[model samples]
Target: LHNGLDFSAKVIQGSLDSLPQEVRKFVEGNAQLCQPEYIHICDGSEEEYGRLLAHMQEEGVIRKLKKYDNCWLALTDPRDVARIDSKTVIITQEQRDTVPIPKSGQSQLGRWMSEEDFEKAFNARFPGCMKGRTMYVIPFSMGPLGSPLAKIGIELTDSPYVVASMRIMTRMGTSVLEALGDGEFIKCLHSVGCPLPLKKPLVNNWACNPELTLIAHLPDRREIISFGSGYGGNSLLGKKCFALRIASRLAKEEGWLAEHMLILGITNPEGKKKYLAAAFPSACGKTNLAMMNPTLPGWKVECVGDDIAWMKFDAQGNLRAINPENGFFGVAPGTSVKTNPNAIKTIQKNTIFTNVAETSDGGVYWEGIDEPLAPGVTITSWKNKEWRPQDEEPCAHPNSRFCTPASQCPIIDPAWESPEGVPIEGIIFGGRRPAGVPLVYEALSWQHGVFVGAAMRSEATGKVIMHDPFAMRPFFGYNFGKYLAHWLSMAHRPAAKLPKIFHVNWFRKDKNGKFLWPGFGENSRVLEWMFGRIEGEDSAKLTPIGYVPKEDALNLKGLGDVNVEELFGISKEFWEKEVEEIDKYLEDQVNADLPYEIERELRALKQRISQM
Candidate 1:
């Protein structure tokens, strides 16, 4: 690998000896292509992190919070703050090769490119891309290192920031390499596109080339080659790229699921813990719900994973889920004591705060932060400018984030990292619809449950909020038609034995636009009802859509002034129009053939709405 490079031969050989031939081949190939300053195979050790932090702090790339223990603040280039979904792509040649291109070709997301075109595109940008940076080889695992459900991936990134973030988000380093010995691993290549010996200093500046940005995936070779952005969603290959997108395709070939879902354990007063996995689109309050402090008495919620869940059946054929992420890369704006106390506590130490407003005392503040700012504290905006409390603009970016270790969460389950994972008793799908979607409803059957997801949507309340079909439209790999088909096939397991499915809309609003339900911790009421239905409690009354809570079904004991009728009301014409739109969506996208069961569910719902 270092044959033609200027790196110290001994330093290069030491890292090479640890890599298996397959891994070495990838490392060598990329090394020969992108000549870097040096190679640093990450050990995921404290010393490595400390050294990296010092270098970053010295380069003015990161700020070590004076008041927080080992916490740092980083502001990124404004343009490179979020994943450029428009530039993301999948490269394949299905048309010429044909459908028995089974292994590599399928429905792709964002821009689709031919293999040869991608080669030309990638070869031009990636070769010698790390000229002024070190290539950090990160051996990481998505789950517990030895778990059968865990997948191995080695991310070779030129951005030290990516290496830092990957450390928090994955089980990385030598342990992952040891577990990956002689086994296959997904190839993850990334660069910030800004090497050393820069024309300008990086003082309060972040480097990226949005024009050259490519979140490219090669599903056939199980590879991810991303360039130009340091945004968490784009640069962290073990995250959205390899975890959900790449894993979704892999999960399809293998019989399992890679869902953008949160896994939580709901422990009742009697000491029995039932786990549920819920899916919601990005920034739709997943972290808050995953770490919620239930207002409902004697009911406790323990978070297993916040962002993604990888589920598969166990010996008894019960669906079990393991949250593939080790930390929360959560939106910082609305996370507060009232909203997510667990998140509040999780980021108190040893965390990375990105694009969040900072105070002179090293205090991090963002919009909706419940705590009052200290008097006389100087506030610096995410843009690195002085900001005042009265400013019309927000001090932090709406998409600003905190990367904190999951173990630090107050309510993290002891079994969070268990190899066997947690057996799910219920599966919940949530969305942010002001109407149409009800407060909560059960899916009459497994196939209908899948349809409820296929028909899932969330109205755009702000510039940020958007619709979510199963809250996974952007995350699922391959054609979504095939993805839905795969979800329907999960019903092959005896329906009675699989997890029960439910849908909830906490963001539902009344005619005046007032929230119909008390969300946040009050959302646990929805969870309790679902748990009851799972235990055979007679809480449901059949409805046109699914089994909704009967009048007085929920224990709204301490709650005041909520009209249950209005909360679960169905508008006949509204749903008729909803079905109409869904019908058109199924036909228009053409990702793959809509699963027969999904189409059947749609037509059946239409018939039921007519009868109602």
Candidate 2:
């Protein structure tokens, strides 16, 4: 983890120093240079070269051509890396010298444009794409964007690495520029941010005018560092690598940071803004809260992110709630719902939609989108063209995703402008609550809450992971267990005693599209309910979203009636409370701010509805 020298500068210098050696030694002296240089690492073994090479070719790397022999390793575009021999097959102990994919790891970056192509296309299509001719690049971490940076490349049995890599620069900027001679592929430094204890002296130097900032985790030292790379020539990681890494790193960082956002709202029938952090497993309902029409009159709610939120303590020792950054990178599945019009609209305008089931008119065939086309071929189409395990599309595709800002969020209200912090009212550590337990279980203390959250992790991986927030596998990776650990350890909340805890299992649904509660699904609702009572919280009860009783929520005629359709019989009016118990609970909790004034202030606002 110790970056001995200026990592960025060293990268640039290293490429140059290693270039002659790599080119002459490995690439068979293609003699022609590749101008802009990129070096990437891959895991797996070196013997997997053929597979890797084929994969690269699939992604479109330039290789020399042996047209007559049908063995073309020549220039990818016939003008790129045209002539090749045994030497052109650049190899290092760990990696091979070839075209660089948009990502270091396996995860597909948005829109499949090769790294170089993406830059060119981005510059051509978007405003400020070529801002200062410097692009920021982020390495692959875990979770939404960057997960425990420490965990990157260290954990998991299946990370890829190439022992050493260097690039050769022959051409200049453009094909034309190279003919006349322009500066070698502009060099940009690479700055790094790591978790604490992993701090390098080089990091603090660019704290102010850094061009790129990345988070790293030094597992050996058990700390994280915030590293930044300067944005000028003589920087390492190269301009292309720098730019792509910036965007890639930003995408993941933004995603993970957004997930920690906490939204406080005065829910109706409660007359107070109880803190509610929705636990959305991937593409469930987090965004629903993001755009939910507040049921109570004048009750304002701000969206931290339908997907991510961060909770931490501020300087004043107050539990501060804020989202680290902005932008929503959301999946396309269920996104076309009438309830998510803003997401849909954002997709239709000012965003990239990948792998979407598109039509000739450039329209998407999503459910409830416009007229909602029949689940089209694209909807059913998957990466490999096979649709079985439910892992494929019909949910979220890897490519078709949408990115928009909270500012453009349709559901956002004025409260979002300057959100008043809310007390940590409820610490919901949810997972797939076990069978024979209430879907929601109230916990006794925050410690218990974290325990419950940690306990909910996958038995196998011991990870509470979520896939990429934006698209499906194509766009990101899944690390449920890791995400849970970070949140439980990081979020701001009093450890004295746990607040009321609720375990939500939304997977349990009944006929008629109405979700059953007190748990859902067959026996699952009852089993989940039983688990909640295991700890026996005095204030605990498994109520449906609308407070519908279990049997009534299921519409069962009588005892032992396991009819699926019975759930449809419950009326919305019978379930939703008129702000009675919830109101009292809010009042009581607000009054007891638990060593924090902001929580008290939020509670006092019960009388000041306008302040909402």
Candidate 3:
């Protein structure tokens, strides 16, 4: 079982011993999974990629495309492609009854499960589950190996699907293990939730129950155990689970910040660079913002990372951040030449697309590709079901993804892998707000910035539609209450030289449901003013909430026939309602300890807006 690798049997035993006796015995006794005939250890090279593809074809996991060179098509289970119940995601603490720390009263984001309960359920279901399976051991690193900020994890799984995706998503294979010499690392275990029968049936295949899929994170011990789904967010331990959820807790204690943000470095023609890290709730265009093709002349935006930023204070007391991921797991829809050219160019080659409609020419097409599907053509839907363009449902799932290496991106920053990371001069928080929010605004202070972030909301719709038609969705970047606490906690640290905080909204709309902001490339206009303000070359008019751009100050060139006053309009009635709603939200949803300063700021804001 040790094979031709430098990894020792003792080390393997040590890892297996960490598992419960039932799981350890399953691993030890399952000849199909343990024998060399079935198991394949990937080496993070093209050869292993080819081998994995061959195995996938043999198992019917992928279908080779005739039109594209070396390209394959995969259709996930109809029920399993997208992330389900992101609200039900959990972090299991050790105590049987006590909840996980930093418990944000927001149960929709995640909940606390006792470790004892999780283990009891896991142990009962795990024994003898690997009867005829092939287990792949993946050693991977988050961030560049040997970097001071990097962390290592070894994932043991029975799914080749997981292995193939992990190879493209992280720095995996022997090189990572060698660099991790004699160092502590995280242990991640994953299974596709298919348990095989031992004697009654020698059948090689097993069915996966979507309900059994549970992703558990143990922050205290730096471990992750994921069951069920093979979707990137659920199975890829290196992603949301480790890099953000677990690392967020780790960062909270270690005096750093782990965030669900995109890091980008904007450069001017004279070679001056200012780095920015921005946070936006899911589906709010974080990837598009990070990989934007600048519309303004002489301004070049380079992608440091399209998702997930790990930030800490540097020796100079300036905030610096690194993208902990080596690849981009981006949404498939709404990515095109106009919206995100860099993202489109990045996935042209060596990408793993999941749950997207495959085209007649062996290419993939999703919603917002800005082209009509080939006329009179039959297509294979993401759910592996066949359909026509006229069908009621879309061919591609809303959460469909393309997983590609970052190096493939045309506009990736040259210094993306630099150990020193990029210096963050500005931090931005944004969300989907159809109204109320201006195109862009700046926070008066760090505490004010945290309030702006914690108070993020999106216009939503209820069963009762309205004349104004405003329904709202609220999210705090990661954990609602904890996010605010973390920001406030970091604000007062002695050496904290943080970036200027700003809020931007591209989703503002008019009464006719037409978009007010041009968005996409034109967003650079807002950024131009932001950078100018950072350089003291620009000034903003103070509003009750924050500083906003003057009507004349905005560069609206090439934008045809727009209403200026309406774009930046402030409704006293609307804002008064907004303030009162926020106060109720803070009292009800945010269960964590609230900072007094933020409370005072909120009170002052309500008072000021009420007078108007």
Candidate 4:
């Protein structure tokens, strides 16, 4: 009868007993394995953190920072970190031949296995997996702990790295455990594949699998089991597992949306505030916009959630969203004071640096740091090897990351922790397309926005790894065709009152192969126009597909000499061919469950472009 609930004890005890015999016994005898006596029921405090840090240092898992207090550097196996092995990732259902649910089209990723198969595979490998290791049972919560929409989860992990991140990325400890009195919570299990003997140094006999890390989720049971990689994407249950892949399916069933989008609040000079959520595929400026420092005087942008957002409508018929994560796990290579000062400032303290080069003075260095790289300094590379700046290969991994608390953000909104979430007014979809896409354009209507999103594409520049050089690559905001259906489903709600949709392309280049518009802070000019249109003050010229900015509509006062005319110009022939390509793509990707209305919208768009 823990926490005054009969079911709580039964559930917790049942889960613990279900573990492999060796693992269960290890948890029961936790203190003997170099683990804290109260590891199973820890209260997140400085005392617990102190013990955990001592354990980490003794195990050579983390190095204390010399320049920053309480900060640490963790060097992941070059094989680990941000490398999501798409092949072994699985979604589990009751049966092996389960197709995507009718309208949801949820399991299109082509990596589905039966719950029985997963249990068999996991059980076969899980025993003695922690033979010499400590089992850390971490009870955590997502979102504001008391919020009705928030969820509780217990991540039992053996890697201290995951424990430390869970501390920063979630509300962890005894409070969450007590809150689980009679409530349902997701059961997550993780292991770094390390055995206790402490025999192997760094590489051998570790459960590190670069080729096949298994990330499996059971939406039916609200459970997640991940093994192999200790990187954030795979190991952190609250991240891509529940926050996106699993939550996306759960959202579809529960009349909500789980998206790879950022939440931000933009306030006008007059003090009127509007919250907006925007989506961009990887490497496309989602985080930058979330922490944007607008150049326009009197205009301000405040960060709410930088990575993932769970949106649902409230009783008042307004779309509300919460970030669901407590910290920012951001890419490191291109982040700098000049590009994203707020992000750079946010990670200066209390961060866990992964796969990034360590400076001689104990700071971290990546490709785009504002200061020049020291010429003669020897730095520790992500591979645990030493290297100088003059090396032919890069020092830091391309997907290096810094895990820091969102509260550290300078521009974080005061209501970042609000259970009610922020009311969103607009949603924008964008990608790294050099042309075709204008600076910005508003969707015709809710259904039209779905079509726009369904057919969204990015040009195949050298940066893009696609087969066709100039052909467009599908960037349908993560979930592909299902994403479009979900958009339409949300729009069909009676009192839905959905946000307006817009598409933008900041990577558009001119004929000289240089960027036309000054990006970074200057992108705020396009946002000003968007806000103007949203408030009915600004207007756009009608086009076959959507609205396009007029020649003089965009503000270009301080902008240096550039082709303003070409910036807003559209290619009729290019779009005519583009329309045909989209029609073909939809035929192949979308299933019969796609709403007929969306299909008609695409047809009409095709016909409109044919006439152009």
Candidate 5:
């Protein structure tokens, strides 16, 4: 009983025979039988539904709990062990009906809305979104330590903000049901293995997040240990899994997980060892980075988990890592020419993705990629992952992975935890900034990192915030909340004990197709410069090749480049200079290069600040 809830749903059974050929093969190949799927819930209410459970048991939806050492697991489908290969199974209605209902006065997240009201609202919003598009919502659990938004803290706990919610994701532009197909959900259940147990229904968002769940199928153990906790009160797979884990979790729970924890080992034969944990959001360059350019002399790059990373702290106070998920999902376009040629071959051409327009031959259409390429007669691939056209699904961008040489990766010994897998040199909070900031460097502190992370945006060439919806830029004074939280959370931990942060703006090209170097593009020099700073070398001397700054620094190598002293000529005073220098700098330094539209906005900002 502790394994999973016994289920009884005909909709699930019929799915096996109804899916498309490609999807069916994917399912039948992965999950041939039923397996338990663990799920956690937070209805945010003490209110109980004993009547509903009792009726559901009679209707074949309820089941009994089993004997797991520390938690409770309700088997939603009893037929898993009974009928070996039919499809998916469900919980017994009789068991579902008997569970006692709790009062609705206790929970905190949805205290304002009772369970009944919550369900009604959800159901009402559900039907309209599925017109011609089928939706699939697979619910599971991630303990407080494993939930992403949860780690953001208690205040953000019950957020109705369905930014990345799985259930909510089903309704997004991505055709989940159509792409994965019917047998899809059933196959996932089968992959986990039969006698599938699931938590009873609940109304809380955080407790039941589809993004947070991690279901592991251990055929050796004949069990699927679903991941719910491990990151204390933050995430399940540590920083490496971030949004990618959430996105993949939203798709499927068990067999679909590429690597619950990935171990990517890379090496440059002629250079120093560089081990990095990639958490690139969808198409923002995780796979590309895996096999992009080989800067190191003799180093080769290999991928462990292009999608997910599982991490845990061992007894030695070090974080141990593993990749439980498996699969090769990638974006296909100009990637065929890269250093890792096999990366493009790994991409399933017919996969579901947004469309990127026609190729030079008028035959191969680029799908899932949407950014402008480098400056040339033909718009080849100048976009380093983000600058693709805006047609395909937003997160459906291409990501590829490859194998690397074992010698270069120090963590390849498999016991990476002993050395802690490359001491997390610095955190690069990725985003787009037009004013042109350094690619990577240490932030003021962890708080500053988080603030910068929150305030980031993809304003390629600083056009403005009119286009990108997922832009992470902060509103004015956006750092206030984190700053305040710092006081509360860091009361014990030293203020300096936070991870070093380097604000990175990866998008720097403009509409003209001209290569903005000091900006974001295929320029390896930026990354090269940043790495230099991380290792304690000076990269500032590397002249503004791609993106020239709005306020350029003094050129030590040559003083008379433009107007050396004029750029820094904002009055030589100390006391009041810092206070009003922003205005002075704007008036003295900002001229034609700064667009009129931007000038208008900044002028308003200055006027507003002066009044404040």
Candidate 6:
């Protein structure tokens, strides 16, 4: 307001008086430290969005799309396109008294640093971080208001990109602030470190000092302080920062689960809907599966969430899960109508795209988008250069993102935003191994499922990342052993009638490298069989691993020349290697507090697979 508008901070800060005293005090104290010239409290209104985007557009940080109504494109620095896990540090309750903080190495899960070092490092980088910047206060909620799983958070950030993205990814602004009313909230602070006084032209640039980036989380205090990077997960404190990092610890303490999972409601021909929660590693088509246009004639699938499911035992003794996010932060490179028509429809309007290639006609394009480039038109890559098929680099960043309102998703469940959440009928774990894993199988018991989840691994892993525990490797708050124990602990609840557990691998391939089962819409067959197994139908045959589909169990109505036997590969050689790999992993790879139940299941699995 002081630098760009006639309005004062008080008038622009519409609901400041309605906010809790603590919020006011935090804002005031933060202003004194960061010394921002102006402050704006987001109201999440159309007028505010227009105003914010106009400033960003004028600054060239965002370019409005011509064809798509209310949509824009952003191209960030090449190096700033992904999560900077190297600097992501978590403040653990246990001090590093026994050990010292290495300048380099971080944990596979969250990097646990002592509280003293976290604050010291943060304070060293935080002072004057937002100088000459607009410090926007975003009051947000992770899930629907009044939901038991919902957690409120207030992020003080200097990036308009973060503010704009936060509006899409979280239930933010006026209502959240009003609902707060002195209630507790996670204290989140972030800055891009680059100030207007030393501004760089917005020619494919992001205001991030990669070296100065520090994501420090104080789980005990429910706080997050991030500096430098202005990327998605790095700067959007409401998303991975609070929803997973801080919330995971809270879930552990409160006897619940915070998972990188998708919640979907699938309906049978009779219109009976059953909900399931599934966890897969990153970029594994959770969005496509959640919003699938069912190929089966009488089946229906609708999305509840594409990422981050918060599950808890309800008062009715049913395990329920809620999606903490209001939107999908989906990968854009390979998303197509064939793979996911609902996703293509969801981002048609009112979306904010980052690091995606742009067209002259005001549309966007990525690597695998169905339509090819026209003769007259040229494509501008994320690097702000004209790109051709022969270019050495991809036009779009591999981690390019599109943030769209989940409410706009064609297949979003009607009960998706409910405060009560949906009762989970089943839980699924999956990986991307092409050879060893099968198409799909059900766990014999909850204890067995824990081992299946813990032993989850993938084919193509990410940077400084792990292949275990549903890809929570980079996000799990603390202690993998304790987290596994928590999963096992869910089985012991009073009068608990738990959901069935299953593991799947959609990336199975034939010897010639052809896909074993046609995935995408064809996956409806696997889902159909999964529901049948849960309904107590004799649709499965017992194997050494688990209950795999019987040769004739799946509904291959539309599939021709399909080899169901090949898809459910249970080779003795593969199973033997898998058992041996998992045994070594459970004993050597898994960090402290390896649960005894998980150990016992592994031993049993070794014996079973040995007989195979």
Clashes of each: 1, 107, 4, 2, 107, 0
Q: In candidate 5, how many Å is residue 447 off?
A: 3.6
Q: What is the lDDT of residue 297 in candidate 5?
A: 41
**Weakest lDDT window of 10 consecutive positions for candidate 6:** 95-104
Model with the higher lDDT, candidate 5 or 6: 6
Q: What lDDT, from 0 to 1, does candidate 6 have? A: 0.83
496-608 per-residue lDDT for model 5 (tens digits)? 22223454444444335432332212323334444445455533331211112223321123212432233212222321322244333323322222233334434443443
Model 3, which residues run further than 4 Å from truth?
Answer: 1-40, 86-106, 198-207, 372-378, 460-483
After superposing candidate 1 on the true structure, give the runs of residues whose Cα lies further than 4 Å from its correct spot.
1-14, 95-110, 199-203, 461-467, 494-496
- Cα lDDT for residue 68, candidate 6: 93
Q: Model 5 has how many clashing residue pairs?
A: 107
Q: Candidate 4 lDDT, tens digit per residue, 1-612?
A: 444211123222135444434334434543332232223444677677777877787778788877786778777776675436453444444333223232333343235667677877676545555655556777788888787668777777767778888888888877786677655677777767555554446662224655446777777767677876787767878877777766776776787877778999998899988889887766777889999999989999999988888889988889999988999988888898778999988987888887788877787878777677566655777676777768887778887888898999999998889988889888888777776667888889988887776666654423642211111121111234455566687766778777888988888887678887778888788888888878876568888868877667877778878676677777788788777776655554455545686789878877887786
TM match of model 5 to true structure: 0.39
Model 1: worst 10 consecutive residues (lDDT sum)? 95-104
Angstrom error of the Cα, residue 9, model 6: value is 6.6
All candidates' lDDT scores?
0.83, 0.31, 0.71, 0.71, 0.29, 0.83
Clashing pairs in 4: 132-196, 193-207
Measured against the true structure, the TM-scores of the candidates, in listed sequence, are 0.95, 0.41, 0.88, 0.88, 0.39, 0.94
What is candidate 2's lDDT per residue for 248-290, written digit by digit as tens?
Answer: 2333333322233235343333343444554434444556545
Per-residue lDDT, model 2, residue 188, is 19
What lDDT is reached at residue 200 by model 1?
41
Candidate 6 segments whose C-alpha is farther than 4 A from its true place: 1-12, 95-107, 199-203, 461-466
